[PDB]
Amino acid sequence: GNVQTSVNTYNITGDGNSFTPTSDMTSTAAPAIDLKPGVLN
Amino acid sequence: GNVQTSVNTYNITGDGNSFTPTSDMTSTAAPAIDLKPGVLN
Amino acid sequence: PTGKLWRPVGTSVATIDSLAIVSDRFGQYSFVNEGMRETFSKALFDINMWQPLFQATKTGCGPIVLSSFTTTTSGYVGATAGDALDNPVTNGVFISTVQIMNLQRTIAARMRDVALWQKHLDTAMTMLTPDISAGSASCNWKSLLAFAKDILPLDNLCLTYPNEFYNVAIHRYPALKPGNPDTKLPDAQAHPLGEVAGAFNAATSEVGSLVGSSSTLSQAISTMAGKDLDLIEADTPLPVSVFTPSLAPRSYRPAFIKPEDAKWIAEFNNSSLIRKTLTYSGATYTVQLGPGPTRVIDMNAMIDSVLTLDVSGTILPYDTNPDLSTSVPAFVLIQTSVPIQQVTTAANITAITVVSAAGASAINLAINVRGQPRFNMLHLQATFERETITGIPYIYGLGTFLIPSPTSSSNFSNPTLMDGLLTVTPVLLRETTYKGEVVDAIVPATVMANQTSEEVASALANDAIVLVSNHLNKLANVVGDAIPVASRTDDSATSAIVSRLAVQHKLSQVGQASPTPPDYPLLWRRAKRAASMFVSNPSLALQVGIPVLTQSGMLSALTSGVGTALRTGSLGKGVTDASEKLRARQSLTVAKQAFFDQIGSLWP
Amino acid sequence: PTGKLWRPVGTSVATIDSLAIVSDRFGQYSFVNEGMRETFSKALFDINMWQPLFQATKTGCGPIVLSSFTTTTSGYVGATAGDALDNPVTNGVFISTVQIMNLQRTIAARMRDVALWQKHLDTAMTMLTPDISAGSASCNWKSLLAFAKDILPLDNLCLTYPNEFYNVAIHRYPALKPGNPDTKLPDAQAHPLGEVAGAFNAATSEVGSLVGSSSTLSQAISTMAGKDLDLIEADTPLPVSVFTPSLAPRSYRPAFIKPEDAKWIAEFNNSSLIRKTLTYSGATYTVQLGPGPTRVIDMNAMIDSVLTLDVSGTILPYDTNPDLSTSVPAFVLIQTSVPIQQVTTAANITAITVVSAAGASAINLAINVRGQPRFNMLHLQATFERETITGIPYIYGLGTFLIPSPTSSSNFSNPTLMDGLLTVTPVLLRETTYKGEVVDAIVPATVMANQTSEEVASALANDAIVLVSNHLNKLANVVGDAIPVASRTDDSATSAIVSRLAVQHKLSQVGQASPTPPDYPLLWRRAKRAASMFVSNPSLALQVGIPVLTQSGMLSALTSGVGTALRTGSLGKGVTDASEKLRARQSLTVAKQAFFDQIGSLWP
Amino acid sequence: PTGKLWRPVGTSVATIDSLAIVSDRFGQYSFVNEGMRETFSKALFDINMWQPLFQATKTGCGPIVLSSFTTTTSGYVGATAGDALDNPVTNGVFISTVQIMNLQRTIAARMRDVALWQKHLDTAMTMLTPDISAGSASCNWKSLLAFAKDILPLDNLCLTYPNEFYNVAIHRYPALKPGNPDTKLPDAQAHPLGEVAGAFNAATSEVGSLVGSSSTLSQAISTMAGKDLDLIEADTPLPVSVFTPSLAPRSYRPAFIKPEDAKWIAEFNNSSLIRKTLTYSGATYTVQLGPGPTRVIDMNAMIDSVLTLDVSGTILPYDTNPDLSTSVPAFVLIQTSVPIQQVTTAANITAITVVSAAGASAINLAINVRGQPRFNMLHLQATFERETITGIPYIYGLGTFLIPSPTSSSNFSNPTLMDGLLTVTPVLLRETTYKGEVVDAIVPATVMANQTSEEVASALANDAIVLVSNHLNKLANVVGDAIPVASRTDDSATSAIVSRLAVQHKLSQVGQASPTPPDYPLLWRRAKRAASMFVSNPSLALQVGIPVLTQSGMLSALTSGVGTALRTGSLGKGVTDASEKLRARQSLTVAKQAFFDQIGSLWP
Amino acid sequence: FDPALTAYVQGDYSTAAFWNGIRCDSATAIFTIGAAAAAAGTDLIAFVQQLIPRIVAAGGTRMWLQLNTPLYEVSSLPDLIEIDLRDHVYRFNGGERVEPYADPVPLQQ
Numbered sequence A, B: 001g002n003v004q005t006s007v008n009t010y011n012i013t014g015d016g017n018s019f020t021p022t023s024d025m026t027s028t029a030a031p032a033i034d035l036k037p038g039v040l041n
Numbered sequence C, D, E: 001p002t003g004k005l006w007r008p009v010g011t012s013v014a015t016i017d018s019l020a021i022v023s024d025r026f027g028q029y030s031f032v033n034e035g036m037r038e039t040f041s042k043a044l045f046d047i048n049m050w051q052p053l054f055q056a057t058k059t060g061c062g063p064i065v066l067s068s069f070t071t072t073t074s075g076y077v078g079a080t081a082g083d084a085l086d087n088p089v090t091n092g093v094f095i096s097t098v099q100i101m102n103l104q105r106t107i108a109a110r111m112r113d114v115a116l117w118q119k120h121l122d123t124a125m126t127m128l129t130p131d132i133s134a135g136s137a138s139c140n141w142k143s144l145l146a147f148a149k150d151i152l153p154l155d156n157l158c159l160t161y162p163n164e165f166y167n168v169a170i171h172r173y174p175a176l177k178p179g180n181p182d183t184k185l186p187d188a189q190a191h192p193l194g195e196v197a198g199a200f201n202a203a204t205s206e207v208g209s210l211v212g213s214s215s216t217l218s219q220a221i222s223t224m225a226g227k228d229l230d231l232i233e234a235d236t237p238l239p240v241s242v243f244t245p246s247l248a249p250r251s252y253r254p255a256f257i258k259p260e261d262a263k264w265i266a267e268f269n270n271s272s273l274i275r276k277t278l279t280y281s282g283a284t285y286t287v288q289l290g291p292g293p294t295r296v297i298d299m300n301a302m303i304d305s306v307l308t309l310d311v312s313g314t315i316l317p318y319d320t321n322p323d324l325s326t327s328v329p330a331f332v333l334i335q336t337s338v339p340i341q342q343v344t345t346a347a348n349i350t351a352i353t354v355v356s357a358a359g360a361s362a363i364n365l366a367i368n369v370r371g372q373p374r375f376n377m378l379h380l381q382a383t384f385e386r387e388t389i390t391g392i393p394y395i396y397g398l399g400t401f402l403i404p405s406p407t408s409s410s411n412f413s414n415p416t417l418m419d420g421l422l423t424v425t426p427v428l429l430r431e432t433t434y435k436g437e438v439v440d441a442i443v444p445a446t447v448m449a450n451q452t453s454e455e456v457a458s459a460l461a462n463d464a465i466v467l468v469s470n471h472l473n474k475l476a477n478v479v480g481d482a483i484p485v486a487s488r489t490d491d492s493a494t495s496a497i498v499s500r501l502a503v504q505h506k507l508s509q510v511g512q513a514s515p516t517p518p519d520y521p522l523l524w525r526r527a528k529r530a531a532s533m534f535v536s537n538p539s540l541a542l543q544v545g546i547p548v549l550t551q552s553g554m555l556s557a558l559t560s561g562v563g564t565a566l567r568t569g570s571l572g573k574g575v576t577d578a579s580e581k582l583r584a585r586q587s588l589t590v591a592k593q594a595f596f597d598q599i600g601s602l603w604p
Numbered sequence F: 001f002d003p004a005l006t007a008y009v010q011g012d013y014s015t016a017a018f019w020n021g022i023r024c025d026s027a028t029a030i031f032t033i034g035a036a037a038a039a040a041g042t043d044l045i046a047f048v049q050q051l052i053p054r055i056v057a058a059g060g061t062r063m064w065l066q067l068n069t070p071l072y073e074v075s076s077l078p079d080l081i082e083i084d085l086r087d088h089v090y091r092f093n094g095g096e097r098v099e100p101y102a103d104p105v106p107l108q109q
């Protein structure tokens, strides 16, 4: 968790972060991308 | 394979044709066209 | 926008009432949103492709442009005056009803036309696997052709139009590259109409196949949300409906199932015999309840089903005790006064109904199979109904024998035909059964590690256990399928469990010398076999005494992990073992290249 | 538009022939229609996300813009000169072949890159279920981190780049909300790149889950149209193909199946024994056809299959009648002159061929298992073929014994090894079998309520019955799945049936005092168990004597209901029992909050 | 473009670093690409439809326009500053987070609202099958209505709002055509809001149903790429993971399985008996290894599973040899010094551990079922673990009896309880087993035609054979399903094989008089049954001695054919037997018209 | 490099494990075979005694191994290679690296 600084807009050990799931936003990316012949074209 | 000539831009027995699969382009037309109620509209 | 187009019937000022579906002599113009044109274009595109075969055979009628079925009207387009008012579209492209009819029956008529040819092109195309999945591999064209000139049966259509099918083909198989006219050489690149689609299906060596790995995920995601794998070990009443129990009729072998191993089956464990009588069809028979305990299907705790006790291949010793022969085997209910397992003698048995006898005694139902006469496969069968047993505290279904005359010979026989393969089929899904009671809702978490080794295999068709097993089984195929719970990859599944074991073993260490700092290399590995043992035999998680798997955390834990795990797979999940998988594909193309080499010699 | 772009090769005037696929040094520009950009953008979007990990590890090469693989050409774009003429596109966005190659191998190369990291991020993410489905629940970040600092095995990648993975993570888990730099506090809202998708997957308390309930429907709709559940009880010849019979090899136990319970199996019911002889491999053996009826597989009405009669665990009494030992058990055909069931004595049996004997007599195939010597599991096996029995009116397959010397001991034995588990496997799907005849088409409606209790379980692998059972079984899972035939919701399924019962019971009341006005509360409930009994055990609808289900209306009725029923589910079908389902999800989040509470204490 | 919108925080010049996610008091504006509006419009469209029922019942709140949740911001929109820089969008349409919340909970709240009504509309709609699939068929409206006025149970919602539901209905059922107000007659055409979708689902007589045939293909394509049917007979090491083995616990009947028919089970074939002893729970018992060979589960070559030997219904002759009674049946390991099958007498058996005994002797576990006392269904059960047997060259699992006192009576008994149905369940998927060895990878092609008839049915749960069977089984359902391997249509499958037989039979003819020119009509037909026999019983392709199917070419061939075959089906694949299929649909509509005719009379 | 044409396997071939799933019709152990015998601290003859059979199993028709045996003479080079005779071994640059050797005849048979 050693401080980084700019590589990415957020530090992990950064000030006031917060793990907190909300039944509202089910985390996630994009797995079901459609590529099948007819559907991709 | 008898010569045709114009019906279609290519003769089958035509000069220098070439059957040659490439793992790169898996031959495919359009089978999975989506038509289900919600998805077609 | 979407829906049918509307226009101000009252003119000019278009309010939420001065509108009206602009119908007319052509039907109603429905708007053709951007994506819906993708389909009808993608459908027509796949037909235009067959252009060279339509002319050759004088069918068809020119290329089908989707711009021949639409129009360029303009107005407000919604689903109802109210909402259509917020979609003013100008010169949009709508297709009138009567048109939505042709674009339909045209794509249908043409679809037949091609579907046929397209079938001939195929028996000839695939008739030389034009598809490899690693590196390339040619096959000198002359041979190839001069070869199929043979194989192809005299009723194809690839022999009547070679380069009328070939031109259609070139656009479907980037294997066949036509020789360019003004340099008389191939092209390196192959340009089939499915240019992109065919590019994105090739088994890319970096990661198996995007089209594969992509679906195997969306597929699993479907199930995960669908059946309701989520909430799999929820601790609270759930309507049986929530378990979509269907096609669920399990069969057994009672007269073997211990009474404590499955509440729905009590036994007459009494000292002597309990010969009773009953006038069935005039003739008086004697139900036996012989020497042994004679386990009988209890009627209460028996969800109005369709009990069908099959008695076949099972021994029928009418050879020794002649007493047995002559007795028509028959499934019979038995209402007892005092509760069974307390019913001592005949005077205790209230009444006995022959719910289904077998016409013809035990000497026509037989069939000698090497001395030991067996039972000609026949199915006796009641149709028990929850309420036909209202009030009646004690009543049991028993597939016994009905001896026409008890004797000394049948003094150690005990005619229970229950050794046969009985098949109960719940005929009324809404009601389930648990621990001996009939309910309308289960409490999942309750059924976990609560059954014994066989308090599971002895479950009654469509009972909590059998439901909390049909459920885990889905969730078991989502992990088995999508997640890699079968390699040393400490996957999302076996990972959700590891975090529970830690948090668990960590607090059990709190208070007292804490001489053992948690392990982890040992925990990861213990939870790996736990998640693995689950995917393996989903059932186990119901049996008392299964390491890890049966602690309240897991499962409730597992699933919700596997859950988010599927909702992030990416697309290139196939990168797993995409090395040996790749090396195996090259292995095949090397052997298939070997094939083309013979096609290339034999038919020069 | 769609397809490759074309341009007037003859210049200016573009007619249906002065066109030509505009190919060149880059390959052929294929048009990139609006939706097809959604994919390649959605694919690249999922890769750009991993930007912070690409720089950290010096791989990658900057963000992949889809605008680097395309171009802005203009011309006519279609599938063929003819139809491409009706799609004049100006400055459209096309991707050249050689480009369609990189956007491919790039998304593939990068896909591997991320697929790997993305796997490490996960074993750590799901390693603390960042997903609940009812209300919220936090877990003080310090602890959480200081905790995973442990668990995570030394070869992850979330320990080598914490806030290089964290930045990737924040965009995939709206659970982790990063603390804002200039107010040093969270954000309430969580902004993960999958903003919308993640919003529309949350288990919305009003109705289960849109992503779930939506698919469970489109899924069922697929089947309904696919297999051809529609037309399930059609009354007219249907090619077996229409039933896509596959992976269909059913096994039995003949020598038990009554001849009338399944046409494909006749028996030698004759007075005495019928000892015949036959020189097999020199040695002369005697086929017995012993004391009992000896049911034998008939050859006609036997779809050229792969009969494999297994004889194992079954008794082998060579202990008593020594006659039995020494005889090599073997499946043998038996051509009889007079039709069986009329074949009295030896002179009647034309010939007997040992289609497959077992090397080594009956005293090496044995194995003592408590007195009663059993049969060491072995499989005898013919390969019957429709025409190898041409002309031959009578011929039967019999898995008998072939005794090397009949004696008085084997005078009541009857060596039929048919008591073994025979497994016929139709090896030629096109041809089915019905009521004893071989056909190419079934008549569905005919097979309904036409079999008996066991004229079904005794069906022959890939015969009408077994086909008109494999079919109902699909339709049975569409209702079981999509429709709610398992709750008091008088669903579309049990509703289609109720309307039949009414219309039916209503005309049966017409003519005569009509003293009974139709019931309805009783009809609804009767049809509810009818539709329910179907979902339960799809098979039943074939057995003569099943209430409601077997009247010609139903099924033909049911399906066409269930049909339209799926084509309207809406999306929020999950509203069914979405109350207890919800209350169960809150139940889980309350228990999972309990977990985070320990992670929060143990590792402070 | 896609993703959240960004804007130059540093102003004016946007440098790919200046850009920052434009967040604020509303959350972050995420772009709403063209297609993603199709969904939210298609979702809202399906809700607006229910407008007439929202007003009637004072719920709702006006029509939901998607243009109420979005905005018209403008900036650069990507997934990360770097790539967002290449998507300058002006006045695009973005939806802010807090909005992505309402459009969500609104569509959710409304979705419940309608989901309910929509359910009542249905029990009434489908309650008169408004869907036929061939020609038309009316039913005079008066009757129809006056009829449902009955059937519909008093708690619907179609009785409280007839023409408030009717108006919703008219848009979902193109069956109900409302009578036009100013000509008081129908319309011929029916204009339901689903105008197009409903047009493209009708079972078009030319080809079954586009919506069906289309999916049955994309469905098969999914599998083909997914599981990895491709590469099905690859000749090279493949991680078991590549076979996604799940829910895989097979059960047997050892003490019958010949040792050579399945490496994981050796036998003590020794002359006399081998009575050994062992102090188990104080009491000294004698393991027998009786008269016969006593086949025992070998421990090596036994993937750490969960062996659960069930002993029930199986004979228990404590009646004769009293020696048997009193002995607690129990699964026991047996470590022998000299390798089994070479272990002669007691001094040879190193030690014997009772891994799981059954409390209570053999006279409480019994239950008389007609003389022959059986075993009360009970499950003994070890949990074998790869390494608990490290070093130990010889050790065997044996479910024997443990007699408390061997006697002359048990001199021909042999107490092996293995005749019971043992069920091994691999509890650690990663490791498979082949030919007796434990491995981590299979070599597919090796397992083809390498097992014998029963060297397959005797396979050990999750062993190469059982894996190279679970695999073919998928590929077997893709052909069975999509491809027409069940009609005389010489399909792509049976075609791929024919080309192999030719190329094969053609070179075998090369060199020597070549007196036989290849056949073809006979080859097509031979390969047709070969491809057919495969779809039929996928397994066979593992057994040595199966015509065609087992030559190295086929399968590797087949699949790669079936492969490309699915990737071209077109859409109108349903044209196959679309004639009788059609004629059967007209058959149903003629019978359903017959129904409407009664609804039309009875309730005038 | 195109995967089909060029493949790369990590780990040594000296260890039995490495040989699982690697089939090539021809192997070439030039510049390594000598270092493996030294690394695995084993006898040169005994080393190739286990390698050659693996190449046979690996499915190899041809083999080329830069073995270091004095077939012409047991004479050595003053600065390039010293041939310690007490223990069959070389000394390329006397020390820089030491690798065991075999004899022309014994290794030949």
Ligand SMILES: *C(=O)CCCCCCCCCCCCC
Binding pocket: A001, A002, A012, D121, D124, D125, D145, D146, D148, D149, D152, D158, D159, D160, D161, D162, D165, D166, D169
């Ligand atoms: C420094 O690296 C100390 C360890 C803290 C984080 C390491 C990885 C565990 C937490 C993951 C954060 C990113 C998403 C899980």
Ligand SMILES: *C(=O)CCCCCCCCCCCCC
Binding pocket: B001, B002, B012, C121, C124, C125, C145, C146, C148, C149, C152, C158, C159, C160, C161, C162, C165, C166, C169
């Ligand atoms: C003339 O027709 C001689 C036969 C050569 C071609 C006939 C059909 C076989 C080759 C098919 C080419 C088109 C796609 C397979």
